[PDB]
Write a protein that binds this DNA or RNA. Sequence first.
DNA 1: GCTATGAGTGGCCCCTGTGGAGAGAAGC
DNA 2: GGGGCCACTCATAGC
RNA 3: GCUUCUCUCCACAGGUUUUAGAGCUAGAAAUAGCAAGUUAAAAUAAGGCUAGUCCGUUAUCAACUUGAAAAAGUGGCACCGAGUCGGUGCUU
Length: 1025
Amino acid sequence: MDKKYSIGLDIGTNSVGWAVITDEYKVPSKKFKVLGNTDRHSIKKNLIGALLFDSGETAEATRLKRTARRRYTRRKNRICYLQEIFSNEMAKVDDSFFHRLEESFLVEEDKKHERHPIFGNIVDEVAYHEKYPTIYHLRKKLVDSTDKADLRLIYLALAHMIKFRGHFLIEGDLNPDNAAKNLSDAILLSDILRVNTEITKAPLSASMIKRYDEHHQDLTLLKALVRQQLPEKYKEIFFDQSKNGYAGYIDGGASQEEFYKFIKPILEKMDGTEELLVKLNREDLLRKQRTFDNGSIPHQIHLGELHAILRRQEDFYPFLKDNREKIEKILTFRIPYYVGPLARGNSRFAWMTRKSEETITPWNFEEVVDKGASAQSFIERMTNFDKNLPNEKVLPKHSLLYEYFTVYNELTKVKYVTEGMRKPAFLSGEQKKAIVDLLFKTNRKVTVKQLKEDYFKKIECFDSVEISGVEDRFNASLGTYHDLLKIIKDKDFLDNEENEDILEDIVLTLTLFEDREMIEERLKTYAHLFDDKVMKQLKRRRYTGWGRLSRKLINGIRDKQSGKTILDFLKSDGFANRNFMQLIHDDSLTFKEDIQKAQVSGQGDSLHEHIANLAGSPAIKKGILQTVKVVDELVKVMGRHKPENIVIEMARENTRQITKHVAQILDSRMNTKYDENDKLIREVKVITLKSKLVSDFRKDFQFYKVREINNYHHAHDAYLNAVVGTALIKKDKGRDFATVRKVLSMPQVNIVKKTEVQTGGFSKESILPKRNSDKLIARKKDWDPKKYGGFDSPTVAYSVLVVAKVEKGKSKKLKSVKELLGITIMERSSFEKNPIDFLEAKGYKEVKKDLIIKLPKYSLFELENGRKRMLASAGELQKGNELALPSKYVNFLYLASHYEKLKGSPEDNEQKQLFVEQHKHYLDEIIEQISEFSKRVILADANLDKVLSAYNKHRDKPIREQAENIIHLFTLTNLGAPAAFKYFDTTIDRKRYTSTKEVLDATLIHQSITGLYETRIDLSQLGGD
DNA sequence: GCTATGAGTGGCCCCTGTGGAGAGAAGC
DNA sequence: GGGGCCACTCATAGC
RNA sequence: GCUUCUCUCCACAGGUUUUAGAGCUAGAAAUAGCAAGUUAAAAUAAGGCUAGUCCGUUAUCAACUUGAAAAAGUGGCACCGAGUCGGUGCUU
């Protein structure tokens, strides 16, 4: 006998609950075989559980990092281009100049040339630094001086401008000498070009030098005043780099705001600080040069400075004059945002179409890359696809053919009643054409009264006509056709079907592009038929929006019997007069066959396809995929007999179409059999419910839940969802409530942490200073971390068990050892390629290959007394046990917590308050149970004693505060990484388990996605010492 | 009797701000 | 939020 | 007309690290005084081959067997009880 049953589901941003129930709402118990080398061969479990897993993340951070990588690469490319331009002349002056520029980051031992980068000698370096304290002094010197400058200095200035080429927020050429646009220039320039009264073509350098000199004078004044009045604080302000003073502001990491905050009280205590205080009010005291406000500098300023320098120095260097346009273009060139990455097809991101196979350079971007086709593809990819034709593309909403289709479809169902007619009749094809020509091409809006007084009365001589199916005006109209009559002014050109392709392409061009240059370039192909004035009028017209049907669907496919398209049928269909719906649903035509051929039944959907295509955050996508896998595994468990009903709830991410999509996916996977009439047999009913009903069900029958106790709440909520759904669809309070009460107190609830392989960054991005520790990771292959600092805190992807011998001590004695070795994400490919060699590099000897077992994150180990640990990393564990608090205590805690916030009748509230008053002794029992659980599985003796002392010291607190603090106390016992928490006025530190040696002799457990199947491996038996 | 270790406790640490442009879906 | 690192400090195994 | 899922591209400013910008005086040193302090180069996830002015942090992943992978297969029931689950009867 196939035992009928039902399955309930709960979907969350972090957890999914699974539960199997029968008509009796009981949870059946079955016994499962255990695989491995343990004596425990079979375990009985309850068919209930919930999966916990990390929140899914979006690609937004990945997208940002990819953009940054490309930007860095292109900046390097621009530097390389400038280097190639200057290389031939540089070889004539200094061969190793670029070599020094490259390896300057290495120590003096690792340099292959002289240590001074710019000149290769100390005297000239001192001269350079003295004559030009900052780069802006050099820039101003090059802008103004007419003397033949040193080539290397010119290269340095050009590189500095290129690598900091500014922003492109304003198009066109800007006037640095600067109604509203001029006002915008004046406002923006003065914010950067502050009071630049000297007549110069490079005001930015003058402003920066003024700021530097003001900084110098202000610092001198502050030093003098402090040394005269407050000698004791001189060392603290000007030598203590750990504070927020000047030493911290320059040598340390202190920023501008912190420095001002620290210095403001000091200025208040001295005399003569009014000017300094005023400058503090304007954020002008001791300001740096390389500051964040520079982000508003337009690129045009740097372009002007570059142009001036090139003009000044070109007379001494002929090669500059020939390449002046090239140098200017390098700065001005940016890849247009609609082109995309310049890839050779080997990337899933790019969409460029290439004309010639030459290497793309900034000087030949125009000649090699089709900007028009590039923009077409850019708009075209990931644009909405036709539903009827998945491969094709929908036409623009303002397409002429779309307007014709809408007009003919609207007129398709129009009936007219005249004198002598007993029944209304459809309009014939000739009638449709005449009506369209007379009104739809002559009136921007066509109404019922207009038709009556213009076609029936005038043309067909019908005095009285009744029109049905149209509400006082026709929704479809030839507005685009009227615009084309306005601009082109050639009726026959528009009415010729030979021009349909050109007109449709023109409409598409006007719909796609907003840059009028692109429109002009693409319509330049059609300028041979239209004069310049008509071309000018069209270029001003713009359209937006997309339709719901494609060209190939309407006027592309033909009936194999008649050869007519859908447009052809709508123009004239005789007595049938089928509309679009009838044409696509008529069996006598091949259009339905064409549509069915268009539908693609590929691999199992909602495995990857819908998971990556449904609308929502990736987290809910992950949750739905896990739910589907859980349902499949449950079906596998139940003997592959599909459940009668499925109840699902989607928790709000702290009428939704995503719920309907999940329902459809579940129906598709479960109901797969068609009947004799090609109709799917729904042996599985899919149920959607509201959380409000289940919440009220909980509130009505004292079946409260607390999210802070343990994770059984998801499973219980799913169980209640299923029970309520089944009860409502089928529609014994004596038996069902008792069954629910028994189920809710069940301790054996399979909770499994989803084992995962950690991915992401290799390590923390904060580069730490050098220090004598081998745990420091280099930024490059050949850069010793002790000598150059680098990355720290790598993230381990997983650890692999090692059974081998290690040389220990100075004697290098081989000692047989057993230990856990973690593998970092940066090392994953190297290890998985050949574990033996990688382990040999680590120093392990006599590797036992067959014993290597993959142990990902959250791998579960079993210890004595039922104590469990989850492998958080190669050197840290997490708690693996849940507090099974009896239901009556949970209800008491809920009532005490909401004691002053009860939402119910006064009598019910009074009864609950009296019940709370009666059972105040529950506090001691809860505390004792917490203590026993902690002693048995937590091992937090010091923190446990502190907690016990705290509870005794405040046994007399009000019940509500007692309950609130006791609820917070569960943080020590919750599953996962231990977390600190406050209990009344005392802070409790987090007990962290930094010892992983004990799990070597433990019981390793592998659990399925639901954990019903268990595979237990005893690591102690392997490689006994 | 000496040293490596390793086991435990407590506390600090983690890259940030902005701009431009381009289809839908779900809801106000 | 949670894991990696450092700095003391003492217990204990190995020489 | 406004919010979000986008999710992709083009962009800027920073920030971090090492090196360079000769510290001086008295003192053997510890140290004491003095002076200066604003900038520059390179990298900005190890690197990989398809060698691109491309790609590298989204998504996917219990164990055993077959498969490059995808993919597929691999695990009795019933009853009675319930502190992380136990006992009883048939069968292979």
